[PDB]
RNA sequence: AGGGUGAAAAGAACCCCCAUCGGGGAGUGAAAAGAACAUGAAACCGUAAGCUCUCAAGCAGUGGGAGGGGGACCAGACC
RNA sequence: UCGGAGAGAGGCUCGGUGAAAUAGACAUGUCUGUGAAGAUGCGGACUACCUGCACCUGGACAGAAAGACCCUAUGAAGCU
RNA sequence: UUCACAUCGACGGGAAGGUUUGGCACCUCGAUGUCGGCUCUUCGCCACCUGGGGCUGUAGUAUGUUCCAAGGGUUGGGCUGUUCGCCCAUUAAAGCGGUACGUGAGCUGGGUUCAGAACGUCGUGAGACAGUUCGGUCCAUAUCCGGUGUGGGCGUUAGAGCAUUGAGAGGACCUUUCCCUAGUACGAGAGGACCGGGAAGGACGCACCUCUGGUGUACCAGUUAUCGUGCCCACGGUAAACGCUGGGUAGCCAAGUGCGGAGCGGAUAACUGCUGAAAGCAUCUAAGUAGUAAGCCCACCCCAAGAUGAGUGCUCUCCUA
RNA sequence: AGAGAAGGUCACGGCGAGACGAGCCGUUUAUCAUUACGAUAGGUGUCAAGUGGAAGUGCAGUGAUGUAUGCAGCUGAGGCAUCCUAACAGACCCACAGACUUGAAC
């Protein structure tokens, strides 16, 4: 349930240590980023002397909530923070090490990312 | 409003939860049945103008009917009923009065049926909750909060509109609710689940007909 | 809205209403027999039902719940000893309603609760 | 908000009937009564 | 109940007392049909030929009145609808009172071959609005004329007929059917006189 | 700001309703004029009897008058 | 965002007591037209059984007297 | 490039509208008051998107211009007293107008720069400013109409109880990506379809409580201070309308769960047409017809015979003297 | 005029119905013996559910405290049973075979 202002880790080794969403994309009006949709986000702190600098505006899907996920199993999921990973326009990850968990929903949208995850549920 | 097939009446009896072989849960309201459901009278358009078929459902203690009616089921040579409905259809040569229907024979798996009933009543409603009214600023200064607004124009037009949407009474109220799904018809409780949430809460009445579909099971007209 | 709510309220807040309540049963098993409000009278009821139930029993337990109730301790000893007497087959339904004439300064409905 | 008239005899008089015959309903609640404790049957009701 | 106690019975044997004694004295009423200029009794009465005639209420009773029947098909519109808007009103009786109904009862039969002339069956308009806004709602004369096709023959009579309670009281005298047939047989319906050249069209 | 029961207090014994006030009889008086008392208009508040209103749009009247009722002596009139 | 539920004091019903500003008379619809140029009251259509109660505030150029703003007065006063 | 009329259209002309800046002073002065936001509508069309078309300097994709079309839609922020406008990130698109700034007896900022004060400037001066600056009180129990609901009376030609027809009225019929068709037509390539199928979303509506929860002063547990119950134990009161915390069933509720938006139905606007005269040729039109729109009307969903035009149906009841 | 038609209102017990009216359900609570219809509310008994391990008495410990008895104790606005209380007593409205005409039938 990330909307505009909110406050986001990054999984990932992009080189953000943190990002303020702006936007949601793809999903038409909707105010409510959940898992698998694609923020525009800004960056608030920078992993210094990286190939990115703070206040640029860039690509993330949103891989962790706080909010809860429900899959058929009637499984439900919930994260501790929220988190997203910086991406291309092509679905590729612009950093290449991602951190934490992720779900199986994201598959279909999203390869690489899966791929790289240290953990999946 | 011709209505496709005859349905049934049938008593809400709340919900839960159901599984399927592939660990998929469906919540699924419970519908159960009583004594009823037995063929009152049939209208022919000749005598009544139009074809219609008036099924009773509950059945009752003698006394609690009035005169009238209970003269209205000896004719028929029925048990005596709470509630009659009526259904109408386009032919009716099927149907005798002191029939009786089963759920199981009108309803098979995976069909769709239409469930009308009684909506909660939630009593007298403000703009807020009636019309979904946005409220107004709850602190700079404002005094407005929960209120209606503004309810028209200046000097012209100079009166309210007709329908101008109000707080006024909300719910209690015959709703229909469309392309619900069977997911299983149990004999031996004579119970029926269906997918989803329908109107009222459990000791309701509930009328299911087979779905209304605008092109193909109406009049084009 | 309300939609099965049950509780009486007796337009008192919460506080209130528990110590009218206490109050009014200490009242009752004292006397035996009172003149209140029929909503007084009918939210009775259940607290009346509660000490009786709770006396068939007397274990130290039930007579030390029955004592953080009721205001005066004496009336609560009557009752453990008094109730396997007077209500033993009794399975339920210890209290009589029985209503009269409304109250002239206000018109209040009122009514006569007794200790059946 | 006030009354920019004033209000005409006929329509007064119709309106404090209205709340006249709200005296002919409990009328009726004490004959009732009345002719209920007139019997000295009820075990509901008592009196003094 | 109709109590039969002596005090009713009483009652209504006085109220017969007090009738048949108002009727003996009374001036007898004397129907207008070859009604010679006085009876030896009215001579006596107030003066009737001085004043205007004002119709009584002997006369106008509803029971009395005239049927017609207006086959509607090659009819044009509105001159039918004038002709009968005089006759339901009473102007072509002698009799005729502006405050009183002395008319006929008119039966439309035939509702769905009445004729117009020109595009008015794909121009006229017949409109009707909710008392909403925006709950303007419009017909053109033919979507009418398949759907409730009388509508159309008394919206057009009622134009014509007066406005007000007495125009609304004659309105219910229009009867108006789509088919052939009407069920008044019994009221004995005459045939409604039409002096308009145009009102008959021909194709 | 608050005047006028009657000629005279003769200001109502006695009985009834009855905790008092208040009342109804009886008695006083030319009259009850009964003490909040002399003539007692209007607004305003009602009660009874006659006709009449619940498909209706209206500064409420007016000319025409259906039907119904009432007191007449110029009963063809008046209300 | 985007509202939700709850507790109290009112609101609501019943009994007791019981105001006020207001008020030519009011048998007090809508549209459009007209008109001292924004009409319940004039015209034409249309719509409307009688009458309560709870709520709402678009209208009645709603209500609370001189319009603080502008001008007038051979007005008033304070000040330079 | 040729070519006035794909698209522009100079010099001039003819209009409509009544939204800009104005002229007038018919209007109200007593307490008939301007611009922005909030809430809440509603209407117009000169159409920003969505539906259908003609022409193109239209290969395709995308345009350009124009025709019919107002059913629906028209975001969230940084900035301003602002109309205006600028930008950020989106989006199918982020339309322009009317309604006394639409809306102050619904809300709130400025504005009528009210009285305090200061700056610049003008004035000898008291003071002044279509200069700036900080501070600065609008009340309201709804009589009538209007409205949203919800009753009674009476009518409905004997009185009732049920079940319905549906005149009329409303709600809703919205929209985006993606995938097959097919990397097929089209084009040298780069690019890349019409038409018709399939899924997922958005907004909105209708319900609902199985799950995830919120509240839950019904309840259960910890726990501080303190006064009660004779004292320990254990409970009760108070710490407003929970002392403070941790949980919570039923209810109510959404962020949760379902479902909806169907029509080889009808008639049209633009347009495309077929037969085909008046003018032995031609012509979509004069006769007659065929396709066709998110528009119009039925169908869908609730209401509905006070629909006084008061409907139809089934049954019941009308004793005694 | 007696009586009280069918039905209605009131009363009495209620509600997932409700500002009030309104709506809906009840009002002796069955019999059964093979279905179902005769439990409205409260109470009582049991069950789901919540909370999270009662008091008392034992043991361990210098003690605060832990541990056993014991899915305990409290609660149970939800179900299901059972008439134990209250649905007692009752009251009011209400009964011109449906004015008049005309055809048709007999
Ligand atoms: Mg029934
Ligand atoms: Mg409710
Ligand atoms: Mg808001
Ligand atoms: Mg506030
Ligand atoms: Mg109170
Ligand atoms: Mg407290
Ligand atoms: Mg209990
Ligand atoms: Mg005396
Ligand atoms: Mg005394
Ligand atoms: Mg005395
Ligand atoms: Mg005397
Ligand atoms: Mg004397
Ligand atoms: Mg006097
Ligand atoms: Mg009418
Ligand atoms: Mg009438
Ligand atoms: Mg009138
Ligand atoms: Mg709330
Ligand atoms: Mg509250
Ligand atoms: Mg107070
Ligand atoms: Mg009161
Ligand atoms: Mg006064
Ligand atoms: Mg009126
Ligand atoms: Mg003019
Ligand atoms: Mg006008
Ligand atoms: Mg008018
Ligand atoms: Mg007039
Ligand atoms: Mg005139
Ligand atoms: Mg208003
Ligand atoms: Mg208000
Ligand atoms: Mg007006
Ligand atoms: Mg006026
Ligand atoms: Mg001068
Ligand atoms: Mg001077
Ligand atoms: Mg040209
Ligand atoms: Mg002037
Ligand atoms: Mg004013
Ligand atoms: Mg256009
Ligand atoms: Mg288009
Ligand atoms: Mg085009
Ligand atoms: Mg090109
Ligand atoms: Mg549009
Ligand atoms: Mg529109
Ligand atoms: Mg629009
Ligand atoms: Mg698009
Ligand atoms: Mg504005
Ligand atoms: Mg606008
Ligand atoms: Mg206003
Ligand atoms: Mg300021
Ligand atoms: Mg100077
Ligand atoms: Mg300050
Ligand atoms: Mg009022
Ligand atoms: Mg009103
Ligand atoms: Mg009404
Ligand atoms: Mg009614
Ligand atoms: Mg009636
Ligand atoms: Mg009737
Ligand atoms: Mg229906
Ligand atoms: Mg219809
Ligand atoms: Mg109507
Ligand atoms: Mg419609
Ligand atoms: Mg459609
Ligand atoms: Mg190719
Ligand atoms: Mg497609
Ligand atoms: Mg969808
Ligand atoms: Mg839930
Ligand atoms: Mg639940
Ligand atoms: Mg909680
Ligand atoms: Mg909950
Ligand atoms: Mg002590
Ligand atoms: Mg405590
Ligand atoms: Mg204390
Ligand atoms: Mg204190
Ligand atoms: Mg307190
Ligand atoms: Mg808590
Ligand atoms: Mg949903
Ligand atoms: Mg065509
Ligand atoms: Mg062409
Ligand atoms: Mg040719
Ligand atoms: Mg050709
Ligand atoms: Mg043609
Ligand atoms: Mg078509
Ligand atoms: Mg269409
Ligand atoms: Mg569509
Ligand atoms: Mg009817
Ligand atoms: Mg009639
Ligand atoms: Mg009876
Ligand atoms: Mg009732
Ligand atoms: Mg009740
Ligand atoms: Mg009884
Ligand atoms: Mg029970
Ligand atoms: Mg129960
Ligand atoms: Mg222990
Ligand atoms: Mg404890
Ligand atoms: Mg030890
Ligand atoms: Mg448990
Ligand atoms: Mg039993
Ligand atoms: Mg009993
Ligand atoms: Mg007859
Ligand atoms: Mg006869």
């Given at each position: 349930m990330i909307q505009p202002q909110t406050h986001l880790n990054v999984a990932?080794?992009?080189?953000?240590?943190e990002l303020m969403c702006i936007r949601i994309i793809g999903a038409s009006n909707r105010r409510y980023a959940r898992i698998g949709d694609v923020i525009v986000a800004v960056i608030k702190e920078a992993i210094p002397n990286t190939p990115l600098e703070r206040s640029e505006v860039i690509r993330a899907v949103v891989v962790r909530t706080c909010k809860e996920l429900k899959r058929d199993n009637g499984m439900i999921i919930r994260y501790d923070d929220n988190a997203a990973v910086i991406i291309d326009q092509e679905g590729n990850?612009?950093?290449?090490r991602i951190f934490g968990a992720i779900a199986r929903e994201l598959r279909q949208k999203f390869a690489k990312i899966v791929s790289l995850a240290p953990e999946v549920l | 409003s011709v209505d496709a097939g005859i349905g049934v009446m049938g008593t809400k009896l709340g919900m839960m939860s159901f599984f399927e072989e592939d660990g998929t849960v469906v919540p699924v309201t419970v519908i159960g049945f009583k004594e009823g459901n037995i063929v009152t009278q049939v209208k022919t358009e000749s005598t009544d103008g139009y074809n219609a078929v008036q099924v009773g459902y509950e059945r009752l203690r003698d006394?609690?009917?009035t005169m009238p009616e209970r003269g209205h089921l000896n004719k028929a040579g029925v048990i005596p009923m709470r509630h009659l409905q009526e259904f109408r259809l386009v032919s009716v040569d099927d149907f005798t009065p002191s029939q009786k229907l089963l759920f199981e024979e009108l309803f098979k798996e995976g069909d769709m049926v239409d469930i009308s009933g009684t909506t909660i009543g939630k009593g007298f409603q403000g703009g807020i909750k009636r019309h979904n009214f946005k409220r107004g600023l709850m602190t700079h200064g404002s005094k407005s909060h929960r209120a209606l607004g503004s309810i028209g124009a200046g000097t012209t037009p100079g009166h309210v509109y007709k329908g101008k949407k109000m707080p006024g009474r909300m719910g209690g109220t015959k709703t229909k609710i469309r392309k619900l799904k069977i997911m299983k018809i149990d004999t031996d409780l004579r119970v029926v689940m269906i997918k989803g949430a329908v109107p009222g809460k459990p000791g309701n009445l509930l009328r299911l007909a087979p779905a209304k579909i605008v092109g193909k099971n109406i009049p084009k007209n | 809205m309300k939609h099965g709510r049950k509780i009486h309220r007796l337009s008192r807040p919460a506080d209130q209403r528990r110590a009218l309540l206490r109050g009014l049963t200490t009242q009752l098993l004292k006397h035996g027999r009172i003149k209140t409000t029929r909503a007084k009278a009918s939210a009775m009821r259940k607290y009346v039902d509660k000490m009786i139930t709770l006396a068939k029993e007397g274990s130290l337990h039930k007579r030390r719940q029955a004592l953080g109730f009721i205001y005066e301790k004496q009336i609560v000893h009557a009752l453990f000893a008094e109730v396997p007497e007077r209500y033993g087959d009794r399975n339920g339904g210890y209290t009589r309603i029985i209503r009269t004439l409304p109250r002239r300064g206000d018109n209040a409905p009122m009514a006569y609760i007794e200790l059946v | 908000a006030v009354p920019k008239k004033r209000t005409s005899i006929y329509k007064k008089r119709i309106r404090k009937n209205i709340w006249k015959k709200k005296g002919y309903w409990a009328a009726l609640k004490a004959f009732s009564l009345a002719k209920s404790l007139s019997t000295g049957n009820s075990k509901s009701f008592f009196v003094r | 109940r109709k109590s039969t106690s002596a005090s009713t019975k009483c009652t209504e044997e006085w109220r017969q007392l007090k009738e048949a004694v108002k009727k003996e004295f009374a001036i007898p009423h004397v129907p207008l049909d070859q009604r010679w200029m006085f009876t030896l009794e009215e001579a006596t009465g107030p003066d009737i030929w001085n004043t205007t005639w004002y119709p009584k209420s002997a006369d106008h009773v509803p029971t009395d009145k005239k049927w017609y029947v207006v086959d509607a098909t090659d009819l044009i519109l509105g001159r039918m609808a004038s002709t009968i808007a005089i006759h339901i009103r009473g102007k072509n009786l002698a009799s005729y009172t502006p405050s009183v109904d002395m008319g006929a009862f008119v039966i439309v039969v035939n509702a769905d071959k009445v004729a117009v002339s020109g595009k008015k069956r794909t121009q006229k308009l017949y409109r009707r609005h909710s008392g909403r806004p925006g709950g303007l709602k419009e017909e053109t004369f033919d979507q009418l004329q398949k759907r409730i096709p009388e509508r159309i023959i008394e919206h057009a009579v009622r134009g014509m007929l007066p406005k007000g309670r007495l125009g609304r009281y004659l309105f219910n005298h229009l009867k108006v059917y789509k088919g052939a047939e009407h069920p008044h047989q019994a009221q004995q319906p005459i045939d409604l006189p039409l002096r308009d050249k145009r009102i008959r069209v021909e194709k």
């Amino acid at each position: 349930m990330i909307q505009p202002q909110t406050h986001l880790n990054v999984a990932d080794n992009s080189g953000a240590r943190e990002l303020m969403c702006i936007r949601i994309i793809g999903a038409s009006n909707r105010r409510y980023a959940r898992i698998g949709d694609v923020i525009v986000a800004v960056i608030k702190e920078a992993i210094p002397n990286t190939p990115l600098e703070r206040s640029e505006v860039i690509r993330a899907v949103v891989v962790r909530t706080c909010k809860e996920l429900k899959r058929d199993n009637g499984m439900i999921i919930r994260y501790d923070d929220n988190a997203a990973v910086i991406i291309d326009q092509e679905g590729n990850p612009k950093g290449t090490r991602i951190f934490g968990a992720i779900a199986r929903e994201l598959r279909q949208k999203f390869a690489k990312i899966v791929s790289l995850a240290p953990e999946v549920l | 409003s011709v209505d496709a097939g005859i349905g049934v009446m049938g008593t809400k009896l709340g919900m839960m939860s159901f599984f399927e072989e592939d660990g998929t849960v469906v919540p699924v309201t419970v519908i159960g049945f009583k004594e009823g459901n037995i063929v009152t009278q049939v209208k022919t358009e000749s005598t009544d103008g139009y074809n219609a078929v008036q099924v009773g459902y509950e059945r009752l203690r003698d006394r609690k009917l009035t005169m009238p009616e209970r003269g209205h089921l000896n004719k028929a040579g029925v048990i005596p009923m709470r509630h009659l409905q009526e259904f109408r259809l386009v032919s009716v040569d099927d149907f005798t009065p002191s029939q009786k229907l089963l759920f199981e024979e009108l309803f098979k798996e995976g069909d769709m049926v239409d469930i009308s009933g009684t909506t909660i009543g939630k009593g007298f409603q403000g703009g807020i909750k009636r019309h979904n009214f946005k409220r107004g600023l709850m602190t700079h200064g404002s005094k407005s909060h929960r209120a209606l607004g503004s309810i028209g124009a200046g000097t012209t037009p100079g009166h309210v509109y007709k329908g101008k949407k109000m707080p006024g009474r909300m719910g209690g109220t015959k709703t229909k609710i469309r392309k619900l799904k069977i997911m299983k018809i149990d004999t031996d409780l004579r119970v029926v689940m269906i997918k989803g949430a329908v109107p009222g809460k459990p000791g309701n009445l509930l009328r299911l007909a087979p779905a209304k579909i605008v092109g193909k099971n109406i009049p084009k007209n | 809205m309300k939609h099965g709510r049950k509780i009486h309220r007796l337009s008192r807040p919460a506080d209130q209403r528990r110590a009218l309540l206490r109050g009014l049963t200490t009242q009752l098993l004292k006397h035996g027999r009172i003149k209140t409000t029929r909503a007084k009278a009918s939210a009775m009821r259940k607290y009346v039902d509660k000490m009786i139930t709770l006396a068939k029993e007397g274990s130290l337990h039930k007579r030390r719940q029955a004592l953080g109730f009721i205001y005066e301790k004496q009336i609560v000893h009557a009752l453990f000893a008094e109730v396997p007497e007077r209500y033993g087959d009794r399975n339920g339904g210890y209290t009589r309603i029985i209503r009269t004439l409304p109250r002239r300064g206000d018109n209040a409905p009122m009514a006569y609760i007794e200790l059946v | 908000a006030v009354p920019k008239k004033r209000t005409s005899i006929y329509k007064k008089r119709i309106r404090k009937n209205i709340w006249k015959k709200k005296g002919y309903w409990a009328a009726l609640k004490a004959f009732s009564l009345a002719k209920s404790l007139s019997t000295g049957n009820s075990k509901s009701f008592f009196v003094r | 109940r109709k109590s039969t106690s002596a005090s009713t019975k009483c009652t209504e044997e006085w109220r017969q007392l007090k009738e048949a004694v108002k009727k003996e004295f009374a001036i007898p009423h004397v129907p207008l049909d070859q009604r010679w200029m006085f009876t030896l009794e009215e001579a006596t009465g107030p003066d009737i030929w001085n004043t205007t005639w004002y119709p009584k209420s002997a006369d106008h009773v509803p029971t009395d009145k005239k049927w017609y029947v207006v086959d509607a098909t090659d009819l044009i519109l509105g001159r039918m609808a004038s002709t009968i808007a005089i006759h339901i009103r009473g102007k072509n009786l002698a009799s005729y009172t502006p405050s009183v109904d002395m008319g006929a009862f008119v039966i439309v039969v035939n509702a769905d071959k009445v004729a117009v002339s020109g595009k008015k069956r794909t121009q006229k308009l017949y409109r009707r609005h909710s008392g909403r806004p925006g709950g303007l709602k419009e017909e053109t004369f033919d979507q009418l004329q398949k759907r409730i096709p009388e509508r159309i023959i008394e919206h057009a009579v009622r134009g014509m007929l007066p406005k007000g309670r007495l125009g609304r009281y004659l309105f219910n005298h229009l009867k108006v059917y789509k088919g052939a047939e009407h069920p008044h047989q019994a009221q004995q319906p005459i045939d409604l006189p039409l002096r308009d050249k145009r009102i008959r069209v021909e194709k």
